[PDB]
Structures are given as structure tokens and as C-alpha cells.
Amino acid sequence: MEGFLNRKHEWEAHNKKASSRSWHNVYCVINNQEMGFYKDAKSAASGIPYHSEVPVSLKEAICEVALDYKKKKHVFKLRLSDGNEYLFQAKDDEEMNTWIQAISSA
């Protein structure tokens, strides 16, 4: 269960709603109550640190759907039980549903 996803940090740096609000295209790799953020399938395979926190916890993750987030259509609000809050944009409903279903299995 790996693939590319658009990631927007709602809260990621203590302050009210983070210091940045960028829409970063990252490669998400699902793991047992964890998720890895890499550059691509090759970066995830070799284990290259694409960011600071690469192996994030997906333990007791809460997920909500955002079918109309301004200019973004198939988006979902994913909040980890680690304080971290992110918005994930998929390419289609089938992908979004598969992502949420996989995350819900953690």
C-alpha cells in the first residue's frame, strides 16, 4: 500500500496552524500503525530521508473526507494520534476510498 499523494500540513510546528501551508507532492508508504514519507518508490525502497520526520505514527488515525476543498476535489483530512494534522489529495475517488480504507485498517 504505497503511492504518490498531495500533502498539506494544517498543523506541524506547535504554532496555531503551522508556519507553512504548502501543498507538497510526496510518496506515502503505509506500515503497521506507521507511515513513511519519501520522494518516490525508489527513495522509499532504499530508505532516503526526504524530510526530517520520515517514519510517522499512524496509530489510531482519524480520517475525514473533503470532496470540495476550494480548488481541490478528492481530498481527505487525516489526523494522526501524534498531534500532527495533514490534508491528503488523491487523483480519484477510487484512490481516495482505497487510501482511507487502508488507513482505517490500522
mmCIF file of C-alpha atoms in Angstrom:
data_model
loop_
_atom_site.group_PDB
_atom_site.id
_atom_site.type_symbol
_atom_site.label_atom_id
_atom_site.label_comp_id
_atom_site.label_asym_id
_atom_site.label_seq_id
_atom_site.Cartn_x
_atom_site.Cartn_y
_atom_site.Cartn_z
ATOM 1 C CA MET A 1 0.000 0.000 0.000
ATOM 2 C CA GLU A 2 2.273 2.766 -1.354
ATOM 3 C CA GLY A 3 1.865 5.623 -3.854
ATOM 4 C CA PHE A 4 2.051 9.380 -4.503
ATOM 5 C CA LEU A 5 -0.173 11.804 -2.585
ATOM 6 C CA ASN A 6 -0.552 15.597 -2.244
ATOM 7 C CA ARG A 7 0.178 16.585 1.382
ATOM 8 C CA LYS A 8 -0.748 19.868 3.103
ATOM 9 C CA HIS A 9 0.239 20.425 6.749
ATOM 10 C CA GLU A 10 -2.631 22.012 8.725
ATOM 11 C CA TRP A 11 -0.643 21.827 11.962
ATOM 12 C CA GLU A 12 3.037 20.815 12.040
ATOM 13 C CA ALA A 13 5.218 23.131 14.220
ATOM 14 C CA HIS A 14 3.395 23.807 17.561
ATOM 15 C CA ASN A 15 2.013 27.243 16.427
ATOM 16 C CA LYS A 16 -1.785 27.695 15.799
ATOM 17 C CA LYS A 17 -1.822 26.168 12.278
ATOM 18 C CA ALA A 18 1.851 25.581 11.374
ATOM 19 C CA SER A 19 4.309 28.139 9.922
ATOM 20 C CA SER A 20 3.757 26.984 6.307
ATOM 21 C CA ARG A 21 0.761 25.858 4.221
ATOM 22 C CA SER A 22 2.441 24.236 1.207
ATOM 23 C CA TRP A 23 0.922 21.509 -0.987
ATOM 24 C CA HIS A 24 3.814 19.038 -1.210
ATOM 25 C CA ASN A 25 3.692 16.067 -3.618
ATOM 26 C CA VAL A 26 5.202 13.243 -1.510
ATOM 27 C CA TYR A 27 5.336 9.424 -1.718
ATOM 28 C CA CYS A 28 3.386 7.766 1.127
ATOM 29 C CA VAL A 29 4.276 4.217 2.261
ATOM 30 C CA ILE A 30 1.887 2.531 4.739
ATOM 31 C CA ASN A 31 3.283 0.379 7.580
ATOM 32 C CA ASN A 32 1.951 -1.337 10.767
ATOM 33 C CA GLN A 33 0.495 1.726 12.602
ATOM 34 C CA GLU A 34 3.097 3.877 10.789
ATOM 35 C CA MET A 35 3.545 5.766 7.516
ATOM 36 C CA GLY A 36 6.710 6.708 5.598
ATOM 37 C CA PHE A 37 7.125 9.968 3.644
ATOM 38 C CA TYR A 38 9.661 9.536 0.801
ATOM 39 C CA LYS A 39 10.462 11.103 -2.599
ATOM 40 C CA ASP A 40 9.215 8.124 -4.664
ATOM 41 C CA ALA A 41 9.038 4.292 -4.830
ATOM 42 C CA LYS A 42 12.845 4.095 -5.275
ATOM 43 C CA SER A 43 13.501 6.572 -2.414
ATOM 44 C CA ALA A 44 11.174 4.501 -0.169
ATOM 45 C CA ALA A 45 12.907 1.237 -1.195
ATOM 46 C CA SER A 46 16.474 2.464 -0.497
ATOM 47 C CA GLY A 47 15.407 4.444 2.609
ATOM 48 C CA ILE A 48 16.415 8.026 1.748
ATOM 49 C CA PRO A 49 15.311 10.761 4.244
ATOM 50 C CA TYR A 50 13.201 13.083 2.035
ATOM 51 C CA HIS A 51 12.276 15.149 5.138
ATOM 52 C CA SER A 52 13.033 15.452 8.883
ATOM 53 C CA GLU A 53 10.419 13.029 10.266
ATOM 54 C CA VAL A 54 10.309 10.145 7.748
ATOM 55 C CA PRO A 55 8.616 7.332 9.822
ATOM 56 C CA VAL A 56 5.448 8.893 11.290
ATOM 57 C CA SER A 57 2.943 7.030 13.516
ATOM 58 C CA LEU A 58 -0.427 6.002 12.043
ATOM 59 C CA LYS A 59 -1.698 4.607 15.372
ATOM 60 C CA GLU A 60 -5.403 5.447 15.957
ATOM 61 C CA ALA A 61 -5.596 7.766 12.918
ATOM 62 C CA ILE A 62 -8.798 9.767 12.365
ATOM 63 C CA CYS A 63 -9.855 10.409 8.757
ATOM 64 C CA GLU A 64 -12.494 12.741 7.268
ATOM 65 C CA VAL A 65 -13.497 13.359 3.623
ATOM 66 C CA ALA A 66 -13.073 16.713 1.813
ATOM 67 C CA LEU A 67 -14.875 16.246 -1.551
ATOM 68 C CA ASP A 68 -14.739 20.030 -2.183
ATOM 69 C CA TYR A 69 -11.785 21.829 -0.593
ATOM 70 C CA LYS A 70 -11.817 25.033 -2.711
ATOM 71 C CA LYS A 71 -9.680 24.124 -5.773
ATOM 72 C CA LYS A 72 -9.002 20.557 -4.546
ATOM 73 C CA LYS A 73 -11.653 17.886 -5.263
ATOM 74 C CA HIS A 74 -10.756 14.433 -3.877
ATOM 75 C CA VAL A 75 -9.111 15.383 -0.567
ATOM 76 C CA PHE A 76 -9.271 13.822 2.911
ATOM 77 C CA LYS A 77 -8.362 15.254 6.328
ATOM 78 C CA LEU A 78 -6.089 12.803 8.166
ATOM 79 C CA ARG A 79 -5.157 13.418 11.817
ATOM 80 C CA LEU A 80 -2.640 11.107 13.483
ATOM 81 C CA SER A 81 -2.741 10.266 17.228
ATOM 82 C CA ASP A 82 0.602 12.116 17.353
ATOM 83 C CA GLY A 83 -0.891 15.657 17.252
ATOM 84 C CA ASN A 84 0.183 16.016 13.565
ATOM 85 C CA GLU A 85 -2.620 17.164 11.204
ATOM 86 C CA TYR A 86 -2.454 16.861 7.358
ATOM 87 C CA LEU A 87 -4.700 17.146 4.247
ATOM 88 C CA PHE A 88 -4.214 14.404 1.622
ATOM 89 C CA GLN A 89 -5.331 14.943 -2.001
ATOM 90 C CA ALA A 90 -5.919 11.885 -4.215
ATOM 91 C CA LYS A 91 -6.280 11.742 -8.024
ATOM 92 C CA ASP A 92 -9.685 9.974 -7.983
ATOM 93 C CA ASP A 93 -12.481 8.713 -5.665
ATOM 94 C CA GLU A 94 -11.328 5.079 -6.114
ATOM 95 C CA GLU A 95 -7.834 6.078 -4.913
ATOM 96 C CA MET A 96 -9.190 8.216 -2.031
ATOM 97 C CA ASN A 97 -11.501 5.386 -0.887
ATOM 98 C CA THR A 98 -8.604 2.861 -1.081
ATOM 99 C CA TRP A 99 -6.323 5.217 0.935
ATOM 100 C CA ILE A 100 -8.937 5.850 3.670
ATOM 101 C CA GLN A 101 -9.866 2.116 3.781
ATOM 102 C CA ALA A 102 -6.176 1.133 4.184
ATOM 103 C CA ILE A 103 -5.630 3.802 6.881
ATOM 104 C CA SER A 104 -8.854 2.672 8.656
ATOM 105 C CA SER A 105 -7.366 -0.863 8.864
ATOM 106 C CA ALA A 106 -4.588 0.448 11.174
#
